[PDB]
Amino acid sequence: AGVKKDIEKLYEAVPQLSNVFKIEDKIGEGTFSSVYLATAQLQVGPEEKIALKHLIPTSHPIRIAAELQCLTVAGGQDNVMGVKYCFRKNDHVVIAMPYLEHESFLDILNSLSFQEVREYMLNLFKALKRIHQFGIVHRDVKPSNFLYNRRLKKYALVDFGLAQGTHDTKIELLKFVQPASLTCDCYATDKVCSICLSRRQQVAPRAGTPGFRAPEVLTKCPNQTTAIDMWSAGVIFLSLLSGRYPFYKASDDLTALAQIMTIRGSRETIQAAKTFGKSILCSKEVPAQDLRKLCERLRGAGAGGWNEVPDEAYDLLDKLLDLNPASRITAEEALLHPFFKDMS
Amino acid sequence: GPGTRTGRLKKPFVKVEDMSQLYRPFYLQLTNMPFINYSIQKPCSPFDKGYCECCLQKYEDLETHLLSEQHRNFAQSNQYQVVDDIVSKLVFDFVEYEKDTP
Ligand SMILES: O=c1[nH]c([C@@H]2CCCN2)nc2c1oc1ccc(Cl)cc12
Ligand SMILES: [Cl-]
Ligand SMILES: [Zn+2]
Ligand SMILES: [Zn+2]
Structure with missing residues (x-):
């Protein structure tokens, strides 16, 4: 009923859709868009299912166009979603893309073989390698933005609506998307004083989703790279290996950081953060967990190839969840990792 | 204390500050810090305008x-x-x- 009214208002907002698509259901929603399943007829092909993405009408034109440019320039290959057409009336923009029938990550998580986990990660890295080659930092890598069809072995990374460009990005439009402080003696202690409390706040990029943000995002590092997407891929992999999703459950950035420190260790996180300009102080030290023991204890070692997960899986996970973004594995490197033996 | 903006953080806490000391620190104070719950059944999180x-x-x-x-x-x-x-x-x-x- 609510979806029914949403659909009616979508045809009203972009009337050309009424003469092309039968809008059937809402299939996804985020902060910046809603996605609908529709049917259409092709001029020179069969009937096709189509995903219609309605962008929030507060989106700046440059942000809308940059998303389209990601889809046209980088998409349509290597497990990256492409674009068929786009319809605009005033501030209402609808992107039409091929529909891929896809699994619920939560529903299939504990009904996946270990080999299907390998194939899923391989195909995620193909998509990330592709977008990173164009200097796209996706920022919102997570299962709901990585469509997976198990039976067809088809995959699609979606949603460039939060992307940022690297300094040398090939997506031109991403380059254009939107009381002096004193030192004090509280530094690296549990103290507060009027000097440090009265400083302006640091602003750094953080568009994304709770539980998938890398430590350098959570701690407001101004210089973020494609490595943040590799962290997010590591979080997906952690969910696959542990059987837990969402793995992290945090309503604010520092709670998310505290959860990461319970997994990867406070001393380890503190040491890595110092390399990117951040001092972290914890009141109580928390040890790093062994990744194999953590995942197997959370998943329950059982049938599926899951009684004999190779060391290479947890080694790759350690490299994706590298607390230091400079050393964190890249997508091109991940495809060469021995975890993927017997697949190339 | 609060009146003079001077004191120490009640524990437990996490405190993050830029190393060059140019920006306000940011803090996390919770009654209970995160704990890995292995007993809660999968697929639940171990941490569960x-x-x-x-x-x-x-x-x-x-x-x-x-x-x-x-x-x-x-x-x-x-x-x-x-x-x-x-x-x-x-x-x-x-x-x-x-x-x-x-
Ligand atoms: O950009 C997308 N975002 C999203 C989600 C929903 C809105 C936030 N990201 N889903 C899709 C997106 O493109 C799609 C193409 C086909 C299909 Cl089946 C699904 C999608
Ligand atoms: Cl002290
Ligand atoms: Zn406005
Ligand atoms: Zn101070």
């Missing part, structure tokens, strides 16, 4: 903002030329029906 970019304006209610003079002006402006220029390169390949006449 907005802004308009066009108008450069915070709003209290989205639908009222979409009706503001500022936003309607923008929505009908030539500011979407950058979008239209990309759309003009795409190929429309769907069947388009005439509007149905009652």
